Design a protein around this nucleic acid. Structure first.
Length: 68
RNA sequence: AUUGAAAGUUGUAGUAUGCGGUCCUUGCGGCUGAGAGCACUUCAGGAGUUGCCCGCG
C-alpha cells in the first residue's frame, strides 16, 4: 500500500523536458543550478533536470492506460 | 494534508541530393671478383723355403 522507491537510473541521448524551445529554431533543455564540494569550495554547476510535473503526467498516463 | 490543491513546454521534422585523388612516367645507361701457381720432392712388399715324405696289376 504505502510504498516509497528511491534510486539512481542511467539515461543518455535524450531531449526530455525542453526548456520551452526557442524563437530562433533553437530548442534547449531545462537547466538547474547545483552546489557541490570542490575541495574546500562551494562551487555551482549547470545540469539538466526533469521536472516533477512531467513524471506526474506520465504516471497519470500509465495509470489510465492500465485501468482501461 | 503546508496559498497548497488540478497541470507534458506538448505533438509532426533525413543536412539531404549528384562528386574518379584524376590523366602522362624505364630506377634508366656503362662494368673481366681478374692476372701469377709442380701435391711436389725420398721409397724393394721385403727378407727365409724339397708337394713333404712309404709303393711288385
Amino acid at each position: 500500500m504505502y510504498v516509497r522507491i528511491s534510486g539512481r537510473i542511467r539515461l543518455n541521448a535524450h531531449s526530455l523536458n525542453a526548456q520551452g524551445g526557442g524563437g530562433t529554431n533553437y530548442i534547449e533543455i531545462t537547466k538547474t543550478k547545483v552546489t557541490v564540494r570542490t575541495e574546500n569550495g562551494w562551487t555551482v554547476v549547470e545540469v539538466p533536470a526533469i521536472t516533477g510535473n512531467m513524471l506526474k503526467h506520465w504516471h497519470f498516463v500509465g495509470f489510465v492506460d492500465y485501468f482501461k
